[PDB]
Design a protein around this ligand. Structure first.
Ligand SMILES: CCn1nnnc1NCc1cccs1
Lengths: 237, 300
């Protein structure tokens, strides 16, 4: 059934699973027309498909051309997501295909179930967690590849960099979700924290800075503060 | 006009004949039902006074044989049987009509209700949903499950309705996933109407039979089937104009006939609100929408 606080450790067991987040698939800027009406202009999007155990991120870039001449784009976007996730699963060797796919929004359940009918053994699950994966586009290198795309494109990342050399998947996921929650709550401050110190760099082949274990504890503490703070600044507490 | 005689009525029982019903007291002198209109299927059904558990009954057509009811004290129910000896049955039933031990099927001449509820229902199709080929009549009760229910456990006692499943490969063409899920016309017109049912009359026949088993026996899987068949039409953008017009008549009489106090269990809020207000056919069911709004506005 649904994924929640009670079965959180299942994410890090040895059954292959993927999170699918569709928030950033259909992205628009709203603007005024010459006549004073409102119109949208779409910008490139992405499907965020993540193995929480390994960090492997299948970033399917959604080029604005896929919306050309289509109607009801917010509805189409969920079926396009489901089509692309199904195509990804079919492209993986059998022993790499997930046993479960967890969607971060419940409106993906029927679209993905229908597209995955050929895979009756793959469980499509919702979650009660409020996961911060929409903030993926706050990661500079991910945002950069999406915006620069001139055609549909799949780009592979490890969203944990090399962290699993030193920490467990559970701890890596908790770090990721803390970083993303911070970026979602106050992007400017979160990025200031991550890059305040010029001496700590981002390796060419990484997404996040090369913090030592001690520096990560400091960083993680700072992100928590930001989240509690903003929670005050928002609620006045 | 035909007759279903009773050897006796040994246990107190409410007897239904089509949409009518009457109470027979323990060892009251009851010998049967006369003046049954020819040309329609009928259902004769029972609810024991001591155990309202298990409504049960028999679908039959008097054109297919002479049928009578005898109480079986071992199995504890009123059983339909066919009398092969025509002259004996005629001598037995005349004898009975002379002693006036029969209730008369009480059809008002203005009244087209039963016709309207059974317009497309044919004994031969009933006997394929209810498989018991040694009898010309078909037993149904409250508890029988459908083939689809069993897939999700005794097969010989199942209601073999046509399986409808909106999230199934049968319903969804590869590469038309979104198209076929949001507009079920393919599934309705090609898979079901052209493929399985052959024509709309057979489709409506099963739909009406499912409703009647839901209403008369409280058969839950029949109610599931009725709603699924309605939803499959309402969720199709492309339906023949004659089917929509007939569907509206069919549902109108079903809603008209439903007991007011059973609407809470026999009517699926989601299906009806979707069908009348959200679906492609939201504007094609004027009679049904008007009776539903005036009789069950709460459900909506
Ligand atoms: C009083 C019952 N009776 N009287 N004379 N014969 C019978 N057998 C019962 C029936 C057999 C077929 C229909 S009714």
């Amino acid at each position: 059934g649904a994924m929640n606080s009670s079965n959180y450790a299942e994410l890090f067991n040895n059954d292959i699973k993927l999170f699918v987040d569709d928030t950033n698939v259909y992205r628009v800027t709203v603007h005024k027309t010459f006549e004073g009406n409102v119109a949208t202009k779409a910008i490139n999007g992405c499907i965020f498909t993540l193995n929480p155990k390994t960090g492997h991120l299948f970033l399917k870039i959604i080029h604005t051309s896929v919306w050309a001449g289509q109607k009801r784009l917010s509805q189409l976007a969920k079926w396009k997501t489901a089509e692309e996730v199904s195509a990804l699963v079919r492209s993986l060797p059998k022993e790499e295909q997930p046993k479960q796919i967890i969607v971060t929004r419940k409106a993906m359940l029927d679209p993905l179930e229908v597209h995955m009918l050929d895979f009756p053994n793959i469980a499509i699950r919702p979650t009660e967690l409020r996961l911060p994966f929409s903030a993926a586009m706050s990661i500079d290198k991910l945002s950069d590849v999406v915006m620069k795309a001139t055609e549909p494109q799949m780009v592979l990342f490890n969203i944990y960099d090399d962290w699993l050399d030193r920490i467990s998947s559970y701890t890596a996921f908790s770090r990721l979700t803390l970083l993303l929650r911070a970026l979602k709550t106050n992007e400017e401050s979160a990025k200031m924290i991550l890059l305040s110190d010029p001496t700590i760099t981002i390796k060419s082949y990484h997404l996040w800075p090369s913090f030592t274990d001690e520096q990560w504890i400091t960083i993680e503490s700072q992100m928590r503060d930001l989240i509690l703070t903003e929670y005050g600044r928002k609620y006045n507490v | 006009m035909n007759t279903v005689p009773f050897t006796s009525a040994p246990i107190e029982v409410t007897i239904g004949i089509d949409q009518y019903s009457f109470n027979v007291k323990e060892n009251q002198p009851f010998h049967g039902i006369k003046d049954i209109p020819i040309g329609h299927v009928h259902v004769i059904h029972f609810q024991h006074a001591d155990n309202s558990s298990m409504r049960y009954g028999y679908w039959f057509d008097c054109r297919m044989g002479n049928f009578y009811i005898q109480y079986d004290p071992k199995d504890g129910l009123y059983k339909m049987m066919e009398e092969r000896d025509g002259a004996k049955f005629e001598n037995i039933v005349h004898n009975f009509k002379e002693r006036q031990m029969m209730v008369s099927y009480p059809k008002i001449d203005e009244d087209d209700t039963w016709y309207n509820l059974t317009e497309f229902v044919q004994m031969d199709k009933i006997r394929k949903i209810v498989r018991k080929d040694e009898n010309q009549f078909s037993y149904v009760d409250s508890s029988m499950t459908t083939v689809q229910e069993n897939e999700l456990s005794d097969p010989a006692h199942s209601l073999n309705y046509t399986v409808i499943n909106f999230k199934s490969r049968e319903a969804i063409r590869p590469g038309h996933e979104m198209e076929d899920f949001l507009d079920k016309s393919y599934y309705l017109n090609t898979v079901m109407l052209q493929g399985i049912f052959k024509n709309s009359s057979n489709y409506f026949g099963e739909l009406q039979f499912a409703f009647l088993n839901a209403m008369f026996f409280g058969n839950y899987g029949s109610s599931l089937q009725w709603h699924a068949m309605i939803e499959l039409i309402c969720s199709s953008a492309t339906v023949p104009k004659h089917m929509l017009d007939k569907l509206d008549e069919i549902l109108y009489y079903q809603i008209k006939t439903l007991p007011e106090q059973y609407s809470d269990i026999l009517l699926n809020e989601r299906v009806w609100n979707i069908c009348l207000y959200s679906s492609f056919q939201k504007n094609s069911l004027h009679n049904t929408e008007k009776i539903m709004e005036n009789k069950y506005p709460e459900l909506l």
